Amino acid sequence: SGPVPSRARVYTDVNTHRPSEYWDYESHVVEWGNQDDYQLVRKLGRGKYSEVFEAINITNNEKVVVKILKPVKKKKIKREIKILENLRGGPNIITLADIVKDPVSRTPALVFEHVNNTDFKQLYQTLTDYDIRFYMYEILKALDYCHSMGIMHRDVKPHNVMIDHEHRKLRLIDWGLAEFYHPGQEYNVRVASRYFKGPELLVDYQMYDYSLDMWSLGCMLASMIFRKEPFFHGHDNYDQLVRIAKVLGTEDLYDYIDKYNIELDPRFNDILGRHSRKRWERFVHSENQHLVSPEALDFLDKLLRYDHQSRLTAREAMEHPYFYTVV
Numbered sequence: 560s561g562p563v564p565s566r567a568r569v570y571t572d573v574n575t576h577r578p579s580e581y582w583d584y585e586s587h588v589v590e591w592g593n594q595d596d597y598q599l600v601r602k603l604g605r606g607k608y609s610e611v612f613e614a615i616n617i618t619n620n621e622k623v624v625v626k627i628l629k630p631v632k633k634k635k636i637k638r639e640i641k642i643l644e645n646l647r648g649g650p651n652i653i654t655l656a657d658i659v660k661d662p663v664s665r666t667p668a669l670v671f672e673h674v675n676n677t678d679f680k681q682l683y684q685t686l687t688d689y690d691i692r693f694y695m696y697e698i699l700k701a702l703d704y705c706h707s708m709g710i711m712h713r714d715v716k717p718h719n720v721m722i723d724h725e726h727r728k729l730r731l732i733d734w735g736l737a738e739f740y741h742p743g744q745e746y747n748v749r750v751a752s753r754y755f756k757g758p759e760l761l762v763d764y765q766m767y768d769y770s771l772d773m774w775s776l777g778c779m780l781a782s783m784i785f786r787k788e789p790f791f792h793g794h795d796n797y798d799q800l801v802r803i804a805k806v807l808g809t810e811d812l813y814d815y816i817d818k819y820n821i822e823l824d825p826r827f828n829d830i831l832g833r834h835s836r837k838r839w840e841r842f843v844h845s846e847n848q849h850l851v852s853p854e855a856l857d858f859l860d861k862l863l864r865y866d867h868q869s870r871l872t873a874r875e876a877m878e879h880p881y882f883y884t885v886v
């Protein structure tokens with residue numbers, strides 16, 4: 560009878576009630592400006608789909624961020640642009656300022672507002688319990704906003720979250736893997752980075768939704784409060800589910816695949832084993848106890864669930880007792 564259908568508990572029909580203009584990215588008209596207004600300063604990093612540079616807009620002496628895209632697929636560039644234009648101005652969303660092409664290379668490039676990234680290794684050691692709560696709340700504002708706009712990020716991870724700690728400024732970036740949520744649509748499961756992949760992706764359950772971002776967020780929270788990076792350390796996509804099963808246990812995993820009538824790939828047969836459900840308190844040690852609290856553990860337990868429908872939505876997460884000290 561195949562797998563059981565599923566749809567988001569929130570913002571289910573946001574794209575359904577909007578004109579095609581909004582979500583039909585293949586029909587979006589992209590106006591490529593002139594790259595001569597921008598001077599590249601330094602490389603900020605390298606990715607699978609792009610090279611990111613700190614730059615200066617010479618027409619106003621203002622620092623910008625320039626993302627040079629490896630022009631692999633036109634549909635994908637149009638999708639990211641449309642999503643960035645749709646979300647432009649949303650809370651803690653990277654602001655697309657310009658779309659340019661270098662006159663000679665004609666390589667697509669996206670120009671963004673400047674974010675001054677604090678050294679992560681230096682940041683990690685000095686972050687307090689309050690700082691974790693504060694920045695988690697900031698990502699949640701970004702996620703509630705994009706989910707409200709019918710968009711799922713699908714690549715929530717530390718590398719996609721820019722923090723300027725001096726100014727307590729946070730931006731969610733890299734919307735290249737982002738997609739419009741349409742109820743009942745079957746999506747490609749080959750999204751997100753291995754350590755942050757939700758169980759729905761690993762079991763090849765294609766009818767996923769905004770809740771995928773909430774699992775990824777839970778992985779980030781678990782690594783931060785427990786000082787264990789990454790939290791679920793898989794060596795491959797099949798092993799990744801085994802690492803999750805070593806914490807959440809195999810009984811709840813079989814409950815999830817039975818609820819949605821999922822067929823577990825035969826590659827899981829000899830590696831999954833049998834695992835008891837572990838208490839979150841077991842991950843507490845002398846080096847992380849100052850970041851752990853019963854509220855933090857209760858909130859984590861509500862994000863890291865196999866059942867994507869049982870995870871807190873970004874709005875429900877923002878209302879959790881863990882965030883009382885921030886607002």
Ligand SMILES: Clc1cc(C[NH2+]CCc2ccc[nH]2)ccc1-c1ccccc1
Nearest residue numbers: 676679691694695717718720721722783
């Ligand atoms: Cl998400 C994050 C992320 C970082 C910082 N990365 C920045 C990645 C980057 C640099 C250049 C391109 N990308 C530091 C800390 C956190 C954090 C803080 C509080 C709670 C959870 C996570």
